[PDB]
Coordinates of C-alpha atoms (C1' of nucleotides) and ligand atoms in Angstrom, one line a residue:
Chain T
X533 CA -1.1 27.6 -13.9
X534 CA 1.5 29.6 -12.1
X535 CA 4.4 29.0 -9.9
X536 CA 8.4 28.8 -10.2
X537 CA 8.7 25.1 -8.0
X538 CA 5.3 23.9 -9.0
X539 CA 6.3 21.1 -12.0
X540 CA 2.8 21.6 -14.6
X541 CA 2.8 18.3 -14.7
X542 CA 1.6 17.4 -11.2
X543 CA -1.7 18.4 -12.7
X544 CA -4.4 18.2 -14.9
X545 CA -7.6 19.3 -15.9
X546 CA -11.0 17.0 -14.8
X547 CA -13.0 19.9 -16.3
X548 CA -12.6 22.8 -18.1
X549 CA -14.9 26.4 -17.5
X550 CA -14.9 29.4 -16.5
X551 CA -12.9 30.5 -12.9
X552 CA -15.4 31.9 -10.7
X553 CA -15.0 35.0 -8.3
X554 CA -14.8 33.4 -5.2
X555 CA -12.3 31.2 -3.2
X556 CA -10.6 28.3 -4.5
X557 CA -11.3 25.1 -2.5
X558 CA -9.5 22.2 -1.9
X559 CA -11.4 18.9 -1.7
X560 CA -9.0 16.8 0.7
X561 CA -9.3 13.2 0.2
X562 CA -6.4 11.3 0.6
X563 CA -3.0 13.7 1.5
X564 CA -4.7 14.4 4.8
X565 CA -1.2 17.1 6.0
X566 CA 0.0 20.4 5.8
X567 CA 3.1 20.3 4.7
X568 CA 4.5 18.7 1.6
X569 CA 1.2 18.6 -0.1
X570 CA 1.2 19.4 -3.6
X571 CA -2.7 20.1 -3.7
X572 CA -2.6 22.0 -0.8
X573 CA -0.1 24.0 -2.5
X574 CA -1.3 24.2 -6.4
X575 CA -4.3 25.3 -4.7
X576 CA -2.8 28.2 -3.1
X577 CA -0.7 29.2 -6.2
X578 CA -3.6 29.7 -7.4
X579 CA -5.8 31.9 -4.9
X580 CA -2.6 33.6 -4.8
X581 CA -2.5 34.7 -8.8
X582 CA -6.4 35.3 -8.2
X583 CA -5.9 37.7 -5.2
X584 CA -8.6 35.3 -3.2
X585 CA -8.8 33.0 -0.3
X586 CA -8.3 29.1 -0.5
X587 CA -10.0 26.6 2.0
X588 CA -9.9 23.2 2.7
X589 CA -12.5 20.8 2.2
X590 CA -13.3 17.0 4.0
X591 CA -15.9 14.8 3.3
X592 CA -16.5 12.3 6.1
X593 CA -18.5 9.0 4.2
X594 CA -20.7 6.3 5.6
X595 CA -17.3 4.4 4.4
X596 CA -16.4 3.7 8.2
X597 CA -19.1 1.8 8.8
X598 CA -17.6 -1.0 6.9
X599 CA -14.1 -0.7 9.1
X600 CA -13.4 -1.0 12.9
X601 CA -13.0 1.9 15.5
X602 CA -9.0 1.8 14.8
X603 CA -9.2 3.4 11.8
X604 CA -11.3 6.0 12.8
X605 CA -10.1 6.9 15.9
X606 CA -6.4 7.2 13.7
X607 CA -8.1 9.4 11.6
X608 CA -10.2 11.6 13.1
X609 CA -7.5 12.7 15.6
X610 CA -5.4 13.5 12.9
X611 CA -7.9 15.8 11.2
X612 CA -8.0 17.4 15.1
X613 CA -4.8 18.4 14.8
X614 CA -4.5 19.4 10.8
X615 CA -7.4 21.6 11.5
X616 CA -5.2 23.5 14.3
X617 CA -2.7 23.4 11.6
X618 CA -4.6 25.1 9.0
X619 CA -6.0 27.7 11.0
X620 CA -2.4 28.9 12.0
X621 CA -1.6 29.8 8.3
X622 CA -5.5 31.4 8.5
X623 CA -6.6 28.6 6.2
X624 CA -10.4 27.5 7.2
X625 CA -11.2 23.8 7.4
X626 CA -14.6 22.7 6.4
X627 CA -15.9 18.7 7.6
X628 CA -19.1 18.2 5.6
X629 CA -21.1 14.6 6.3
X630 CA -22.5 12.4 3.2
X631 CA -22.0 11.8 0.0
X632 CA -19.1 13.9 -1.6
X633 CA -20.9 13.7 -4.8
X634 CA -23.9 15.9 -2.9
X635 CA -22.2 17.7 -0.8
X636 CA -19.5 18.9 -2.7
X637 CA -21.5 20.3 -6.1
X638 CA -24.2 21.8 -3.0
X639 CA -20.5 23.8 -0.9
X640 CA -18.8 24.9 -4.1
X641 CA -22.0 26.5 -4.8
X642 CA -23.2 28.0 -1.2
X643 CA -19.4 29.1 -1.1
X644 CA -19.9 30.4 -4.8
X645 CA -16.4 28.8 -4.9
X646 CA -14.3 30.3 -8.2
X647 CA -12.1 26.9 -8.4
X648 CA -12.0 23.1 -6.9
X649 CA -9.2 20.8 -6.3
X650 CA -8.6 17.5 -5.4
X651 CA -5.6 15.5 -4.8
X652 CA -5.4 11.5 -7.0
X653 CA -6.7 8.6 -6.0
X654 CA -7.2 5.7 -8.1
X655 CA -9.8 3.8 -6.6
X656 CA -13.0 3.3 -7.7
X657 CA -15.2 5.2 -5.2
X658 CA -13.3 8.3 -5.7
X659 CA -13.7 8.2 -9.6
X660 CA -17.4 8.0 -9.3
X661 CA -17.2 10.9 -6.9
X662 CA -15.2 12.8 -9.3
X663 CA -17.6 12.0 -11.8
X664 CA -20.6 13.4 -9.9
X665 CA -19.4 16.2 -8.8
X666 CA -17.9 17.2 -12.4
X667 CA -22.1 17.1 -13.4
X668 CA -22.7 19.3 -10.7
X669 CA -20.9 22.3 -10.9
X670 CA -19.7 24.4 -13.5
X671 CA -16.3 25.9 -12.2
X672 CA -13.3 24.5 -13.3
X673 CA -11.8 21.2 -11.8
X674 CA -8.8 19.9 -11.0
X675 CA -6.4 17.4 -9.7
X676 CA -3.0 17.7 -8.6
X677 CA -1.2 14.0 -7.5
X678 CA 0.3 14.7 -4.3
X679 CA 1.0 11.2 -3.0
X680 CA 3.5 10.0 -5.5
X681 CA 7.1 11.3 -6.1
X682 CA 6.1 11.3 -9.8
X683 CA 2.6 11.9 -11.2
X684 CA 1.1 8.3 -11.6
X685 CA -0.3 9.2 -15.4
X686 CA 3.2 10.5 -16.1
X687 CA 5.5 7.6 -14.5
X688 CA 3.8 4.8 -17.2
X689 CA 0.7 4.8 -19.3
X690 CA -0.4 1.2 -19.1
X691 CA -0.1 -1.3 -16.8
X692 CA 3.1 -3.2 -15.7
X693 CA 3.8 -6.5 -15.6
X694 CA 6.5 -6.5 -13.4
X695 CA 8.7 -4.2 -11.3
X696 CA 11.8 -5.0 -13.4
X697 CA 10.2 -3.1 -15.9
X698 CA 8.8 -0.6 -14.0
X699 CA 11.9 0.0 -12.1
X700 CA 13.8 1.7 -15.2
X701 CA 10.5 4.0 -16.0
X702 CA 10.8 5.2 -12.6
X703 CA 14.1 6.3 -11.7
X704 CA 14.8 8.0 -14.9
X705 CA 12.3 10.2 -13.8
X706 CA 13.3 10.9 -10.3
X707 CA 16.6 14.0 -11.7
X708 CA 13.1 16.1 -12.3
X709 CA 10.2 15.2 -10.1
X710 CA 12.3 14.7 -6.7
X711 CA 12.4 18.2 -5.4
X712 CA 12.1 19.6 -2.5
X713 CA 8.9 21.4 -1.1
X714 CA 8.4 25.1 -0.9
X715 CA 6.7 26.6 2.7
X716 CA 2.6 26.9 2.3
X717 CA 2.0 30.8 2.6
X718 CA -0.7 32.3 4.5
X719 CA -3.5 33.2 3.7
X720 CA -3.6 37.3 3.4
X721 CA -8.0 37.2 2.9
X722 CA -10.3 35.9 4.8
X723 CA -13.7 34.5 4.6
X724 CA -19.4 20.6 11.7
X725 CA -17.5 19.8 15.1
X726 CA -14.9 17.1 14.7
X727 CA -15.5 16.5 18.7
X728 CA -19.4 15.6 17.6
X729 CA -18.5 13.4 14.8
X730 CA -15.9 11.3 16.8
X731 CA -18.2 10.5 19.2
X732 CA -21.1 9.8 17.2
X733 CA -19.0 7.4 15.0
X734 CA -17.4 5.3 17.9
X735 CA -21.0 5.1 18.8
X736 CA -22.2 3.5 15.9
X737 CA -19.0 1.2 15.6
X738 CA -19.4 0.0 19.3
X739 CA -20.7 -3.1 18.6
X740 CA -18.5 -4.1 15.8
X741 CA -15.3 -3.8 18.2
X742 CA -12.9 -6.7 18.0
X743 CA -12.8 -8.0 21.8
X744 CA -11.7 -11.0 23.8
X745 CA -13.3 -13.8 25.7
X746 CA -14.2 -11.9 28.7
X747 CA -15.0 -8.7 27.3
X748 CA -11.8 -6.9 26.5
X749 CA -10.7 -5.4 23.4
X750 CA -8.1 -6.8 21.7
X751 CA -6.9 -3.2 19.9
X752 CA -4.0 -2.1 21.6
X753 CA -4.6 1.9 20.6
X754 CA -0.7 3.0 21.7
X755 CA 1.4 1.7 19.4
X756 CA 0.8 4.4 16.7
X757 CA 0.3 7.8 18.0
X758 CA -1.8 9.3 14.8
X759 CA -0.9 13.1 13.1
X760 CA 1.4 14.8 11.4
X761 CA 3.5 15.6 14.1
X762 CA 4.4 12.2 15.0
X763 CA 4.5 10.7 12.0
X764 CA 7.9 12.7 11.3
X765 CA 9.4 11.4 14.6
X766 CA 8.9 7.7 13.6
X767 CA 10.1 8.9 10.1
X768 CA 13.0 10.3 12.0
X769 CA 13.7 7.4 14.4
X770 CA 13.8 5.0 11.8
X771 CA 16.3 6.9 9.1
X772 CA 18.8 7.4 12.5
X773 CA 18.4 4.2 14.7
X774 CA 16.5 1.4 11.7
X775 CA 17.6 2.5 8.6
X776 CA 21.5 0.8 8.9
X777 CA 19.9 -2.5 9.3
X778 CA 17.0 -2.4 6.9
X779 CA 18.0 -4.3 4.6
X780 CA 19.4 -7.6 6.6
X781 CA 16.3 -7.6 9.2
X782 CA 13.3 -6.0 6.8
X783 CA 12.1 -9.6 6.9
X784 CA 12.9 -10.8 10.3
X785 CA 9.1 -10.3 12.1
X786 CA 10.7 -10.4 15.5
X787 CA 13.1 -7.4 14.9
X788 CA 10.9 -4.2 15.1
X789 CA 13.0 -3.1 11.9
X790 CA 10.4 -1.4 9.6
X791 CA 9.6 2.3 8.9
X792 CA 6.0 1.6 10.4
X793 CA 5.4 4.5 7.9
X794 CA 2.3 2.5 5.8
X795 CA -0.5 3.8 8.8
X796 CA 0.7 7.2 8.5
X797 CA 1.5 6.9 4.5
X798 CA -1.9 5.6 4.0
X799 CA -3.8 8.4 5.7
X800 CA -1.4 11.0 4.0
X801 CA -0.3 12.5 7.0
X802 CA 3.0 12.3 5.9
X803 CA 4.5 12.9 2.0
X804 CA 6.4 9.9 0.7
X805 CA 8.4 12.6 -1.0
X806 CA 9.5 13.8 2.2
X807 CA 10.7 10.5 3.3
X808 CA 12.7 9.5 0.3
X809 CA 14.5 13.0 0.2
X810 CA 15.4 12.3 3.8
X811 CA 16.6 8.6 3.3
X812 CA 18.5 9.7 -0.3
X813 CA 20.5 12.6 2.0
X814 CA 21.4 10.1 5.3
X815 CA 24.8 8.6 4.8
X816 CA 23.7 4.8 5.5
X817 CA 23.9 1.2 5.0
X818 CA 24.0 1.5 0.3
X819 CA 22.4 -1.7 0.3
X820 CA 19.5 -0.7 3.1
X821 CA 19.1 2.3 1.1
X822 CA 18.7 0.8 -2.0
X823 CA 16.3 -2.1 -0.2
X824 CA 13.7 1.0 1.3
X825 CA 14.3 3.1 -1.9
X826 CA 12.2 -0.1 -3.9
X827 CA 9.6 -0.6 -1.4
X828 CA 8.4 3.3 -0.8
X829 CA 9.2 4.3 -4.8
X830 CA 8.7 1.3 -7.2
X831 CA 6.1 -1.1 -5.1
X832 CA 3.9 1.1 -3.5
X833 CA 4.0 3.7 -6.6
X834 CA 3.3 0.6 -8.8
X835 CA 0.1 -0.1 -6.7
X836 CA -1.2 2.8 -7.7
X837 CA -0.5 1.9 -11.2
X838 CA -1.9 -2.0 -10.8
X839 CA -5.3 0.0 -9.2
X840 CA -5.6 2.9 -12.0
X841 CA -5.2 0.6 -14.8
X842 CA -7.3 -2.5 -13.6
X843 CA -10.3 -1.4 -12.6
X844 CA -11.0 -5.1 -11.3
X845 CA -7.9 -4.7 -9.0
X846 CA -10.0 -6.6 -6.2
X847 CA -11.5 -9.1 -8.4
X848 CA -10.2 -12.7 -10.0
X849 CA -10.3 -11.3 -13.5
X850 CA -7.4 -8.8 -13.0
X851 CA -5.3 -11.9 -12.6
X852 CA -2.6 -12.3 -15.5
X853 CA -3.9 -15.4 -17.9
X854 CA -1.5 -17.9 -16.8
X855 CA -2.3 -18.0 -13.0
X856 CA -6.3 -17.2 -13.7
X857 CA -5.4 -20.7 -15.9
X858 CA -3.5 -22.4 -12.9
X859 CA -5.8 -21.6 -10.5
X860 CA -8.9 -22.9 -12.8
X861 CA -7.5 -26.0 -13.5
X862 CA -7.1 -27.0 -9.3
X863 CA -10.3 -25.9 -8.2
X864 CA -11.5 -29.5 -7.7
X865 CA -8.6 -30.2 -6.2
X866 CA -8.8 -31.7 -2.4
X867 CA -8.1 -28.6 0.3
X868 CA -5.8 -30.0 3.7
X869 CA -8.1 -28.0 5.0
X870 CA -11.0 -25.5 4.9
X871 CA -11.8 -22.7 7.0
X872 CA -14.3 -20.2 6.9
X873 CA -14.3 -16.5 7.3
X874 CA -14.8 -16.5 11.0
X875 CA -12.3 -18.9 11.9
X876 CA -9.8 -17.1 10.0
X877 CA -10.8 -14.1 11.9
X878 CA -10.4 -15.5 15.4
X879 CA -6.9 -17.2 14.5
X880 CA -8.5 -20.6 14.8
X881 CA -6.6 -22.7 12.3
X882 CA -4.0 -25.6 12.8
X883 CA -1.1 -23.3 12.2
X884 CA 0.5 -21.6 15.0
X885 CA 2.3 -19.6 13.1
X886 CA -0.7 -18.5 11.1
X887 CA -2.3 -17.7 14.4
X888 CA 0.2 -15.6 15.6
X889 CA 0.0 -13.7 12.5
X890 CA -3.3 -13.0 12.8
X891 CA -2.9 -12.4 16.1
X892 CA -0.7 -9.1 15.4
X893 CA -3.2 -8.1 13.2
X894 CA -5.6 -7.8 15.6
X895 CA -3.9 -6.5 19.0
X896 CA -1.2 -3.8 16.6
X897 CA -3.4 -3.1 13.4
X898 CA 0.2 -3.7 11.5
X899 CA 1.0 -6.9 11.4
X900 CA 5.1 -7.6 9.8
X901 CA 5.8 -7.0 6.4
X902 CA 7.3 -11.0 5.9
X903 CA 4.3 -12.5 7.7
X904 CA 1.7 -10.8 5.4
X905 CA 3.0 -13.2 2.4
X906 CA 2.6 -16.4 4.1
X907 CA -0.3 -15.2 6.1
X908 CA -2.5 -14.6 2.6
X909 CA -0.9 -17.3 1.1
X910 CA -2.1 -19.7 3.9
X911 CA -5.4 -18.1 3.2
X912 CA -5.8 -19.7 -0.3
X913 CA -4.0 -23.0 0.8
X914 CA -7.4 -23.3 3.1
X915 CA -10.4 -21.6 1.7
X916 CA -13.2 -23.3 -1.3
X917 CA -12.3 -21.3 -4.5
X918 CA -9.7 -18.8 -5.5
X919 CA -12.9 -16.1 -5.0
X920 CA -13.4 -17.1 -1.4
X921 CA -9.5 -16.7 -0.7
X922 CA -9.3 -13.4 -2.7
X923 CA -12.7 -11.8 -0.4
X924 CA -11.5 -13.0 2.8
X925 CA -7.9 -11.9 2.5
X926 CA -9.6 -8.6 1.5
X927 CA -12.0 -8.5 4.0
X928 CA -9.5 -9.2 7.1
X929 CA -6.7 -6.8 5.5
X930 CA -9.3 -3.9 4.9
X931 CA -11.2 -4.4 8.2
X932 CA -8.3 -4.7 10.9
X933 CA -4.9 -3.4 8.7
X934 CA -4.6 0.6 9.7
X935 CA -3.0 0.8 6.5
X936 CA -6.5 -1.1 4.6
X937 CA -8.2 0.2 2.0
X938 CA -5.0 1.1 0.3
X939 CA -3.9 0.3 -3.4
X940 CA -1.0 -1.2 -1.8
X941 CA -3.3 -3.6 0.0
X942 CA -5.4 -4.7 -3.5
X943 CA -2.0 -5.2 -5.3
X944 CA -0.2 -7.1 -2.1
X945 CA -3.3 -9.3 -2.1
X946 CA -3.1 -9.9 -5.8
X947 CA 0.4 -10.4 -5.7
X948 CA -0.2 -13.2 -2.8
X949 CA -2.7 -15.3 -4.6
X950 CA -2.7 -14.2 -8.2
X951 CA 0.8 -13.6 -8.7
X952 CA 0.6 -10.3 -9.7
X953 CA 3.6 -8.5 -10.7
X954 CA 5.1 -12.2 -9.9
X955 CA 6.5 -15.1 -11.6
X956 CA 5.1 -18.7 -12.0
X957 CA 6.3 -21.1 -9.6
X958 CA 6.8 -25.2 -9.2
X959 CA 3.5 -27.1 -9.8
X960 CA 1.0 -27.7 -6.5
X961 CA -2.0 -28.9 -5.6
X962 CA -4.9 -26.2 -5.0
X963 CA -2.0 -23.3 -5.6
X964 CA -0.9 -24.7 -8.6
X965 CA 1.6 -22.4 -10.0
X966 CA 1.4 -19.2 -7.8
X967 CA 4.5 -18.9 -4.9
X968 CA 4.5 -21.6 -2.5
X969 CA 5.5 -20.4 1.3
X970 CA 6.0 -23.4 4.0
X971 CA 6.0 -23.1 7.9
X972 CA 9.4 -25.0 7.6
X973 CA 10.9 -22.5 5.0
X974 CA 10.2 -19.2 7.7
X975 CA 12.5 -21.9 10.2
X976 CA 15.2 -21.0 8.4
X977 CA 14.6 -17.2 8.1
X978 CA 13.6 -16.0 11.6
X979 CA 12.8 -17.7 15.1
X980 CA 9.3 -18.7 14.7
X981 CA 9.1 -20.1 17.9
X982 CA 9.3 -16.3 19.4
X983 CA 7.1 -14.9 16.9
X984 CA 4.2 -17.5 18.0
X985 CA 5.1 -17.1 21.9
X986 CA 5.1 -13.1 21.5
X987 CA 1.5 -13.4 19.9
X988 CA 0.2 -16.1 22.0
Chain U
dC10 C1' 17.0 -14.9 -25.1
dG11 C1' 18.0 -12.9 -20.1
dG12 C1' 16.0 -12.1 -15.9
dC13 C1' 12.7 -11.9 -12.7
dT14 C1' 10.7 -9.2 -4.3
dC15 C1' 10.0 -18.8 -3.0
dG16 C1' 12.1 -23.8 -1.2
dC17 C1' 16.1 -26.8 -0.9
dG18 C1' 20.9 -28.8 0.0
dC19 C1' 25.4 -27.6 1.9
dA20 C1' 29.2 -24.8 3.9
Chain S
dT1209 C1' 22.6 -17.4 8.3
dG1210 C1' 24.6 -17.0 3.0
dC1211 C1' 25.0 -18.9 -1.3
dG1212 C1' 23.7 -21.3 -5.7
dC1213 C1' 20.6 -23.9 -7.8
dG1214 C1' 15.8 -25.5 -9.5
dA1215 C1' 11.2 -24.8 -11.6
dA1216 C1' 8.5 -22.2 -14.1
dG1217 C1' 5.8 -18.2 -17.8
dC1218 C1' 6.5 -14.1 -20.1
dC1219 C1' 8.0 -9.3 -21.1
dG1220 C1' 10.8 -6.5 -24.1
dA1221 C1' 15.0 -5.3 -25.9
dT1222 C1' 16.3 -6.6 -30.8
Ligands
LIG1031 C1 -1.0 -9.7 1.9 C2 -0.5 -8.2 1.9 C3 -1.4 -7.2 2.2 C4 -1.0 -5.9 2.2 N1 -1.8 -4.9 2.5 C5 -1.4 -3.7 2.6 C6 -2.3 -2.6 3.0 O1 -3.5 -2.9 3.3 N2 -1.8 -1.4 3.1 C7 -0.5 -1.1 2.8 O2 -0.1 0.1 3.0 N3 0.4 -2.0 2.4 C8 -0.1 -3.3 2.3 N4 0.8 -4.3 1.8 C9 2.2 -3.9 1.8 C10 3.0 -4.1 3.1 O3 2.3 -5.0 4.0 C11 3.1 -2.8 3.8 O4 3.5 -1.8 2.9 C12 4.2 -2.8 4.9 O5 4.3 -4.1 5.4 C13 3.9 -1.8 6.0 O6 5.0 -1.8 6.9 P1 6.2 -0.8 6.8 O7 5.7 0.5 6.1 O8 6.9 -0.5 8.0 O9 7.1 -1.5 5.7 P2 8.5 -0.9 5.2 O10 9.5 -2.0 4.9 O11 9.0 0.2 6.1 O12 8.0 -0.3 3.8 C14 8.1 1.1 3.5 C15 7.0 1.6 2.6 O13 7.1 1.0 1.3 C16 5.9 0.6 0.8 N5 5.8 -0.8 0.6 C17 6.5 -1.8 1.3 N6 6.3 -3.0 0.9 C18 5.3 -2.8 -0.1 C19 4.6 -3.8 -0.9 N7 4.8 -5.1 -0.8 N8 3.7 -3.3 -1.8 C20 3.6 -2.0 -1.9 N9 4.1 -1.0 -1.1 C21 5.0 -1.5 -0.3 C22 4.8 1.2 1.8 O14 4.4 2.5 1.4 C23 5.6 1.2 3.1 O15 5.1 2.2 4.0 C24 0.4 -5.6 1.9 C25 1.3 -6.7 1.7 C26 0.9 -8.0 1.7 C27 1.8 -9.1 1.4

DNA sequence: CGGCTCGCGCA
DNA sequence: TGCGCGAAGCCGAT
C-alpha cells in the first residue's frame, strides 16, 4: 500500500475486501520484537494512511503442552518485556488464549477491526490458521514476511535441491532487499495478564520437567537471558569478540564460538536483517564473514524454502528418490545397535561422545552446531526403521532444542538422515548412501575427550 | 560435464 | 591441524 522504505514486495494479499473503519491489527506469530519488524511496520503504514490506531495481537496455543518449561519460560518473558515495549510507542498488546482460528475471526470482530496482518510462517499449523481465520472474517488480510532478508515467495518459486543453486538466487537479490530499517512511529490515536498465564502454564508443565536422579532439574535457565534487549548484546558480543574467529572454530564444540543467535532468531526477538547488516558493515576476518553470511542467509532462508514447498518436511516422503531408495533397500539390514526413544533421551547409549551430546542438550537447550550432525546421524545408525530415526530425532530436537519447532530444525533433521539439500555418499550398511560421521573422524577435528568430560 | 556444508593418508 | 583425494547421484548451464 504506502510507504517510501517499505519494498511492495514484502507483502501480499491472503484475502481481498473491503477496509473496515476501525484499527488495523497485527496478528504476531513468529517476529515476536519491536524493532526491525516489517509487519509491525506495514501495519502501521497503514493505520497511518487510514488516520486509525494499530494493535498488536498474540495468540498463546495449547502448542506448549507438547514442549518443556524452557521454552516457555524463554518466551513468555520476552513477551513481558515487548509488551513494555509497545506501550511506550502507545501501541496496545492484546494475549488471547485458544485456537487462533476462534479467537482471531471472534477479536477482529469485537474490535470491529478495519484490517489484519500477520507476519510468514511456513509451517503447517499456521496455514491452517490462516485458512480459518480467512472464512471467518471479512476485512481484508494480509501477510508481510518479516523474518527473511528477502521475501521467501520472492527468493525462489520451487524447491531447491541444493544450496549451490540456491546460493546464486540469493545474493543477486540482496543490492534491493538488504536495507536498513526505518524507526516504528507512535501511535497518535488511541483505543489477559501475562503474569497469570506464566504461572498457570509452568503449572501444567511441572510434571513433564526434565530432572536428575535425586530430584534436580537438569535445565540450567542462565545461559540465555531471553528479550529483545539481550538478544542485541549477544549479537553485539559475538560480531566484536567471536566474529574474527568464526570461521576456523565454527566447528570446534569446545570453543564457545557461535553467534548463539538461533534461541533468539527462532522466537523473533531479534531480525536476521539486523544481524547481517551489522556483520556486512564490521571490518573482520573475509573468510569468517563469508562463513556466517551462508549459515544466517542461504541455510536458514533455504529452510524456510525446504518447509513451504514440502509440505511433508517432517515425514520420509520429502526425502529426494535416491536416498528414500538407499534407505529402503537396508532396512533389513542388522543394527550394531538399537535403542529406544527413552534411552536416547537419558544419554544411555555406548557412545560417550553421543552422551555428552545429549547431555548439552539437556543442561543448555543449545547443544553445538558440529555435534548436532553426528548426534542425528548416530540416531539412525541405532534406531528400527528410517521412520523411527526420523520421529525420535524430531521429538528430542523439538522437545529440549530452545531453537525447536523451527524450519531450520525439519530441514537439519532431513539433511542428517535423508540427505537433504546433500550429496550421496560411500555405500554402508543400515545408512547406505546418506553421510557417514565416525567417533574417530571428530578425533581429528576437536578434543573429544574435553567435550565428553565437560558434559559428564 | 563440473561441482557439490564426510573419512582417510600424509606433511 | 591443513591439504588433496575418494566415492557417490544429480542439478543445470548449454
Ligand atoms: C540435527 C540438527 C537439528 C537442527 N535443529 C535446529 C533447530 O531446531 N532450530 C534451529 O534454529 N536450527 C537447527 N539446526 C541448525 C543449527 O543446529 C543451528 O542453526 C545452530 O547450531 C544454532 O547455533 P548458532 O545460531 O550459534 O550457530 P551459528 O553458527 O551462529 O549460526 C548462525 C545462524 O545461521 C543459521 N544456521 C546455522 N546453521 C544452520 C543450518 N545447518 N541450517 C539452517 N540454518 C542454519 C541459524 O539461523 C543460526 O542462528 C539444526 C541442525 C542440525 C544438524
Amino acid at each position: 500500500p504506502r510507504g517510501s522504505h517499505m519494498n511492495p514486495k514484502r507483502i501480499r494479499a491472503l484475502k481481498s475486501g473491503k477496509q473496515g473503519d476501525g484499527p488495523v491489527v497485527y496478528w504476531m506469530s513468529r517476529d515476536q520484537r519491536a524493532e526491525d519488524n516489517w509487519a509491525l511496520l506495514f501495519s502501521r503504514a497503514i493505520a497511518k494512511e487510514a488516520n486509525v490506531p494499530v494493535v498488536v495481537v498474540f495468540c498463546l496455543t495449547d502448542e506448549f503442552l507438547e514442549a518443556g518449561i524452557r521454552q516457555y519460560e524463554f518466551m513468555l518473558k520476552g513477551l513481558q518485556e515487548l509488551e513494555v515495549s509497545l506501550s511506550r510507542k502507545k501501541i496496545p498488546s492484546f494475549f488471547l488464549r485458544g485456537d487462533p482460528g476462534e479467537k482471531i475471526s471472534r477479536f477482529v470482530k469485537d474490535y470491529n477491526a478495519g484490517t489484519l496482518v500477520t507476519d510468514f510462517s511456513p509451517l503447517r499449523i499456521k496455514n491452517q490458521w490462516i485458512e480459518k481465520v480467512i472464512s471467518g472474517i471479512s476485512i481484508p488480510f494480509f501477510e508481510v514476511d518479516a523474518h527473511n532478508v528477502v521475501p521467501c515467495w520472492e527468493a525462489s518459486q520451487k524447491h531447491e535441491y541444493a544450496a549451490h543453486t540456491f546460493r546464486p538466487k540469493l545474493y543477486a537479490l540482496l543490492p534491493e532487499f538488504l536495507e536498513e530499517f526505518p524507526e516504528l512511529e507512535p501511535n497518535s490515536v488511541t483505543p489477559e495478564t501475562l503474569s497469570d498465564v506464566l504461572e498457570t502454564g509452568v503449572k501444567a508443565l511441572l510434571p513433564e520437567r526434565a530432572l536428575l536422579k535425586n530430584k534436580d532439574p537438569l535445565f540450567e535457565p542462565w545461559h540465555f537471558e531471553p528479550g529483545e534487549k539481550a538478544a542485541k548484546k549477544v549479537m553485539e558480543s559475538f560480531i566484536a569478540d567471536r566474529l574474527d574467529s568464526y570461521g576456523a572454530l565454527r566447528n570446534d564444540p569446545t570453543k564457545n564460538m557461535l553467534s548463539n543467535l538461533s534461541p533468539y532468531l527462532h522466537f523473533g526477538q531479534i531480525s536476521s536483517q539486523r544481524v547481517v547488516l551489522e556483520v556486512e558493515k564490521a571490518e573482520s576476518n573475509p573468510g569468517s564473514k563469508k562463513a556466517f553470511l551462508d549459515e544466517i542467509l542461504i541455510w536458514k532462508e533455504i529452510s524456510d524454502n525446504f518447509c513451504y514447498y514440502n509440505p511433508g518436511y517432517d515425514g520420509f516422503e520429502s526425502f529426494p528418490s535416491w536416498a528414500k531408495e538407499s534407505l529402503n533397500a537396508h532396512r533389513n539390514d542388522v543394527r550394531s545397535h538399537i535403542y529406544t526413544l527413552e534411552e536416547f533421551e537419558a544419554g544411555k547409549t555406548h557412545d560417550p561422545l553421543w552422551n555428552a551430546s545429549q547431555m548439552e542438550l539437556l543442561s543448555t537447550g543449545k547443544m553445538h552446531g558440529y555435534t548436532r550432525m553426528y548426534w542425528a546421524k548416530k540416531i539412525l545408525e541405532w534406531s528400527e526403521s528410517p521412520e523411527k530415526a526420523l520421529e525420535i530425532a524430531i521429538c528430542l530436537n523439538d522437545r529440549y532444542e530452545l531453537d525447536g519447532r523451527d524450519p531450520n530444525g525439519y530441514a537439519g533433521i532431513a539433511w542428517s538422515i535423508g540427505g537433504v539439500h546433500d550429496r550421496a555418499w560411500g555405500e554402508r550398511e543400515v545408512t547406505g548412501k546418506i553421510r557417514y560421521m565416525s567417533y574417530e573422524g571428530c578425533k581429528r577435528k576437536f578434543d573429544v575427550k574435553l567435550y565428553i568430560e565437560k558434559y559428564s
